[PDB]
Ligand binder design. Sequence first.
Ligand SMILES: *C(=O)c1cc(C)cc(C=O)c1OP(=O)(O)O
Length: 106
Amino acid sequence: SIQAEEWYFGKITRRESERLLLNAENPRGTFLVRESETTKGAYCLSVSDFDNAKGLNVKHYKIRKLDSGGFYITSRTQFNSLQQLVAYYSKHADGLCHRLTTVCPT
Ligand SMILES: *C(=O)c1cc(C)cc(C=O)c1OP(=O)(O)O
């Protein structure tokens, strides 16, 4: 049950996700998962980042879900659940702008 997850914001827009994440109190890695505005069945992982170049900014990654059961951002690294995916990206930055650190505050 993904909607039970505190990091799951469900049906919110891309603009809303960025409004929530662009708060100055948010450290790098602040994140949320929401439905994709356009892609049916896909989820979107929105993550805050920060650097002296760009300052505070937001990145979006598409989370695909296979009828065959797997969840993934890259087909090479798949998970049995969205929860396991989130747990894995909280420790490995891999190709993400930062590892997932803190759930986005409302
Ligand atoms: C998430 O589904 C998503 C992923 C990327 C790489 C980009 C964007 C847009 O900024 C996404 O949001 P979406 O609402 O699906 O367009």
